[PDB]
Amino acid sequence: TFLVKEDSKNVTAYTPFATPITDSKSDLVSLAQLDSSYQIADQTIHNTNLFVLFKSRDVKVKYESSGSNNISFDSTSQGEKPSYVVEFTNSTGIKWTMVKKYQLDVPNVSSDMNQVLKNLILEQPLTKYTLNSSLAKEKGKTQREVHLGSGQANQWTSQRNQHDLNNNPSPNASTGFKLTTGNAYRKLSESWPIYEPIDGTKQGKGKDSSGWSSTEENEAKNDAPSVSGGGSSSGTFNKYLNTKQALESIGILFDDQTPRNVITQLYYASTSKLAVTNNHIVVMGNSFLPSMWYWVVERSAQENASNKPTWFANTNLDWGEDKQKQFVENQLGYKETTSTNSHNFHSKSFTQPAYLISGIDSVNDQIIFSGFKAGSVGYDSSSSSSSTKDQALAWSTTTSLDSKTGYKDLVTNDTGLNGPINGSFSIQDTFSFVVPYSGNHTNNGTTGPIKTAYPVKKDQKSTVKINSLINATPLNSYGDEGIGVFDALGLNYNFKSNQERLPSRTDQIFVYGIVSPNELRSAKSSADSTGSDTKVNWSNTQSRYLPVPYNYSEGIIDADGFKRPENRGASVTTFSGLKSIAPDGFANSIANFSVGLKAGIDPNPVMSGKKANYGAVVLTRGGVVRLNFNPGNDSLLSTTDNNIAPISFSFTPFTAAESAVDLTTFKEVTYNQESGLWSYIFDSSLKPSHDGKQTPVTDNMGFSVITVSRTGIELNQDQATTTLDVAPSALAVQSGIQSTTQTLTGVLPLSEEFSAVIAKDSDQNKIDIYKNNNGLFEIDTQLS
Amino acid sequence: IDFNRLFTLPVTELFDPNTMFVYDQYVPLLVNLPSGFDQASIRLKVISY
C-alpha cells in the first residue's frame, strides 16, 4: 500500500488500485505527541517502519558570545521547540503507533569555535526574485593598493619581492569586495531584512546593521512597501525589492514582519532532510540557506537523551586532491594572528564551515550526500586605519591558460593558491580574465617562480582584525568585475589545440560523497566531544566545479577560448551589468542551485558474483547530475587515467521543457525499484504569493513531473565492463504529467506501466490515471 | 485486498492442482463472511488463471 501526505500533519494510505483506505488519515504530529506548531518536514521508509522529521514554526534559538553554552533555545520566548525524528509502525487496515522518538538538540560550542562565531557574519538568503545586481558588490582594493599603497604604481616590480609577491604579473588584481553597501551581512544574534537592493553596488548597507536600522531601512520601507490584501502594492520600487513573501516560502520564520535571527533561521533550515540506516539516522539542511552542522543519531539512543549535531568545520572532506582542499582553506581567512582577536575559520584550524545541501539518502547501509559549497571568506573589522577596512578578502582561483592539460593537472595548478592573480589580459586577437602564465613562464621566456599572497600588508599585520563570513550562494567573490562573471558561467578556456574549460576551485564548487556507518560513528564522537573540537574524516568524497549555464544570461551564446570584442563590454562583463534570461524561476543567472538528491539500485542484472549496481541523481540549474559508485567497494566509481575527470560524476544538459521547470518548487523525488526511474515532483503551490515589486503571482497553481533515466555503458554488465573509462550518465525528461489549475496531493506509482495523480480542482478530489510508457506519460480518459 | 501478503508468490500454490479448489486458508482473504462462520460450508473453485 501507498502513503499520501494530505497536509502538513496528516497521512492517508491508498491501495494499489488508487483507492483510499477508510480510517487511515492519521495525524502523525498528534501521534508523535507534538503540539500544533509542528509539521512533517520529511518522511522515509526503512525496515518496514515510517521515519518522520518534524519541525516547529515556533522555534527560537539564541547566540551569546559569553559563557560555555553559546547556542541555546530561547526558553524565555516560548520557542523551546526542538526538532524530532519519530519511528512509526503498523499494529493492524492501517493503524500507526509510535516506536522511538529522537530529539534534535542544539550544537555544542567549544572556546575555539566561539572565537570565530563571536564575529561570524552571514549574507541574507538568496531568493527567487534576487537579481544579479543584488548579489553584486562594490569591487575592492587592488593587489598593489593593499601591499604598497597609493602613488606606488611605479614600484610594483621593485617592491613586490618584499611582500612575497615575487614575479607576480598582476598588480591590478582585486583583493575582494566592499561590505559598506549591498546584501545585508548579520551576526548569529542579528536579524536579516525583508529588503534586497536592486543595485548592491550603490543601495544596500552590507555588514553595517547600525547604518541600516538608523537611516537606510526607512528609505527601503518608503521605496518598497509590502502589499496589504489584493491589488499590486502602489510602491515606487526604484532602489529596493520587498521579498517578505519569497523569504517565507524558503522557510524564513517571522515575528510579525521582522524575520527571526540568523541562528533561529539556521536551526530551522538545518532540520530539513532525513536518511535512515540500520544503526543511524541522519538529518541535514536544505538547498535554500547554508548548513553549518548535521545530525548523526544512533537508533539505539535512550528515549530522553539529547542528540547534538556535528559541525561541518570539523568534517574533513576529500576535495579530490590535497591542493583542491587548500584553495578552499587558504581563502577561509588569514593565519599567524599577530593581532589577537584576528579569529577566522582558517586561523583557528577548521575546514570548510558551510554547505548548500541538495539532498541526503541511503543505499546498502551507506549514506549519500551532495550539494554546493557555500562561499566562506575572511573580512576586515579594524575600526581605526588599515587599507582593507570593511572589505571581504576573496579572489579568483581559476587555472592559468599555460597550465598542463588533464583534469589532475588543471585542478592542482598553483594559480591563485595563496592570493589573487586574475584580472584582464589581451591575448593575440582576443582577451582573457584568467592569468596567462604560471610557474617560471613569461611571454619573453622564463624568469623566477610566480608567487601569490593573502591581501594583508606585513606592516599592518598586527593592527588587523581578519574575521569570518558565509554567503548565501556557492560564490566566494562578489566583486563587480569580469573574472567573477567568467568564473560563475564557465567561460574560462585555454587556447591550446585540445580545448578544455579552466576550472575555479573556490567559486561554484559542487561537493558529493558516500559515508560508511563508521565514518558516521566518528561524526557522532565529534559532536559529543567535551574539550577541543575532534576532527571527522570523510574519505569517499570528491569535488567538481559546476557553473551555471552561460545561455541563462543575455549576450553569451558560446563557451570557447576566442571571445568577441562586445564580450569585453561592462554590460556583459560585470554582475551589475549582466542581464538574466533564466527560465528556472530565478531572477539571477549567476548563482548555482542543486536539489533532490535521490539514490536508487539499478534493476538491470549484473555479471554473476558482482554486487548490484546503484547510483544517485540530483538536479542542478541547467541539467541533471549523476553520481557513480562501485558497489563491490561501496566507494565512488574511479578510473586509472588522471587526465580524465572523475568518472564518479556526469552532467547532462536540460532542454527548454526541463529548464522551464521552476526548481524552487521542488516537492518530492521518488525512485521506482522495478523501472530504475526517478520521478521529480514539483508543486507550483510552493511559489510565493507576491514578487519583488509586491505584484500577486498568477502561476502559483498546478504541478509538473520530470523523469530521470540511466544512460551509457554500466559497470559489471559483462567481462568487458569490469572497469569503465567514461562516466555513466542520466537523462532529465519532462514526463508528460502536468497541471496549471489542479492542486496536487500525491502521485502513486500504481505499478510499472501506470501511475495515479491525486489532486483538487475545487475542494473535491480527482484521481487521474496516466499510462506509463517507460518514463513518458499520457492520460487515460477511460480509466477515469 | 491484501496483494502485499500471500499474493506476492505465484498463482501456483494458491490452489490445489488436482482438485482445482483454492486452499482453505486463503479463502478468508477473498470472502467477506459474517461473525462466527463455519468456513467448511463454503469453497472457491478456480475457473481460470
**A45: Cα within 13 Å, side-chain hemisphere:** 8
- Cα distance between residue A480 and residue A201, in whole Å: 8
Instruction: Please list every residue in chain A whose beta carbon sits closer than 8 Å to the beta carbon of residue B2.
Output: none
Write the DSSP string, A447-505: -SPP----S--SSSSTT--EEEEE-SSS-S--BSSHHHHHHHHT--B--SSS--B---S
- Contact partners, residue A468, CB within 8 Å, separation at least 6: A116, A119, A120, A121, A332, A333, A343, A344, A345, A353, A376, A377, A378, A379
- Contact partners, residue A164, CB within 8 Å, separation at least 6: A451, A453
Q: Which residue of A has its CA nearest to B5?
A: A1
Q: Which residue of A has its CA nearest to B1?
A: A15
Q: How many CB atoms lie within 10 A of CB A583?
A: 15
Instruction: Please list every residue in chain A whose beta carbon sits closer than 8 Å to the beta carbon of residue B4.
Output: 1
- 3-class DSSP assignment, residue A31: helix
B8 touches chain A (CB under 8 A): no
A19 touches chain B (CB under 8 A): no
In angstroms, the separation between the Cα of residue B19 and the nearest Cα of chain A is 31
The coordinates were experimentally obtained by: X-ray
Q: Looking at chain A, how many residues does it have? A: 784
Distances (CA, A) of A344 to A111, A114, A329, A548: 13, 10, 11, 29
Instruction: Please list every residue in chain A whose beta carbon sits closer than 8 Å to the beta carbon of residue B5.
Output: none
- Cα distance between residue A50 and residue A61, in whole Å: 29
- Contact partners, residue A33, CB within 8 Å, separation at least 6: A98, A101
All cell numbers assigned to A718: 559483462
Let me know the angle formed at the C-alpha of A612 by A606 and A614, rounded to the nearest 5 degrees.
Answer: 120
Burial of A532 by CB count in 10 Å (0-12 exposed, 13-18 middle, 19+ buried)? Answer: exposed
- Cα distance between residue A14 and residue A1, in whole Å: 6
Instruction: Please list every residue in chain B whose beta carbon sits closer than 8 Å to the beta carbon of residue A1.
Output: 4
Torsion angle, alpha carbons of B23, B25, B27, B32, to 10: 180
- Cα distance between residue A132 and residue A576, in whole Å: 6
CB-based burial, A733-753: b 16+ in 10 Å, e otherwise: bbbbbbbeebbbbbbbbbeee
CB-CB contact of A758 with A745 (8 Å): yes
CB-CB contact of A135 with A575 (8 Å): yes
Closest CA to A165 of A440, A481, A455: A455
In angstroms, the separation between the Cα of residue B44 and the nearest Cα of chain A is 23
- Cα distance between residue A576 and residue A146, in whole Å: 25
| For chain B, the helix, strand and coil percentages under 3-state DSSP, each to the nearest 5 | 20, 10, 70
| For chain A, the helix, strand and coil percentages under 3-state DSSP, each to the nearest 5 | 15, 30, 55
Which residue in this structure is represented by grid cell 556526469? A650
B3 touches chain A (CB under 8 A): yes
CB-CB contact of A533 with A110 (8 Å): yes
- Cα distance between residue A31 and residue A42, in whole Å: 16
Q: How many CB atoms lie within 10 A of CB A256?
A: 5
Torsion angle, alpha carbons of A162, A167, A171, A173, to 10: -110
CB-based burial, A423-442: b 16+ in 10 Å, e otherwise: bbbeeeebbbbbbbbbbebe
CB-based burial, A29-59: b 16+ in 10 Å, e otherwise: bebbebeeebbbbbbbebeebbbbbbbbeeb
Closest CA to A656 of A743, A733, A735: A733
Burial of A693 by CB count in 10 Å (0-12 exposed, 13-18 middle, 19+ buried)? Answer: middle
Which residue in this structure is represented by grid cell 509590502? A226
Residue A153 is classified by DSSP as G
- Cα distance between residue A15 and residue A559, in whole Å: 51
Question: Beta-strand (E) ranges in A509-622?
Answer: 509-515, 536-538, 541-545, 594-601, 614-620
User: Phi/psi of residue A758, each to 5°?
Assistant: -105, 125
Closest CA to A663 of A128, A198, A256: A128
8 Å CB contact of A15 and B1: yes
- Cα distance between residue A285 and residue A51, in whole Å: 17
- Cα distance between residue A565 and residue A572, in whole Å: 11
8 Å CB contact of A15 and B4: no
In angstroms, the separation between the Cα of residue B48 and the nearest Cα of chain A is 21
Residue A114: its H or E element: helix A111-117
Which residue in this structure is represented by grid cell 572532506? A317
In angstroms, the separation between the Cα of residue A734 and the nearest Cα of chain B is 31
CB-CB contact of A329 with A352 (8 Å): yes
**A479: Cα within 13 Å, side-chain hemisphere:** 29
Instruction: Round to the nearest angstrom and report the end-to-end CA distance of chain B.
Output: 18
A93 touches chain B (CB under 8 A): no
All cell numbers assigned to A476: 566566494
CB-CB contact of A292 with A71 (8 Å): no
- Cα distance between residue A485 and residue A494, in whole Å: 17
- Cα distance between residue A433 and residue A394, in whole Å: 16
Instruction: Please list every residue in chain B whose beta carbon sits closer than 8 Å to the beta carbon of residue A15.
Output: 1
Residue A78 is classified by DSSP as T
Interface test with B, best of A15, A21, A674, A751 (most B CBs within 10 A): A15
- Cα distance between residue A176 and residue A479, in whole Å: 6
Distances (CA, A) of A74 to A63, A71, A80, A81, A338: 9, 9, 6, 9, 37
CB-based burial, A379-410: b 16+ in 10 Å, e otherwise: bbbbeeebbbbbbbbbbbbbbbbbbeebbbeb
CB-CB contact of A517 with A96 (8 Å): no
B2 touches chain A (CB under 8 A): no
- Cα distance between residue A594 and residue A544, in whole Å: 13
**A317: Cα within 13 Å, side-chain hemisphere:** 29
All cell numbers assigned to A4: 499520501
Q: Which residue of B has its CA nearest to A2?
A: B4
User: Phi/psi of residue A76, each to 5°?
Assistant: -65, -20
Let me know the angle formed at the C-alpha of B9 by A716 and B4, rounded to the nearest 5 degrees.
Answer: 95
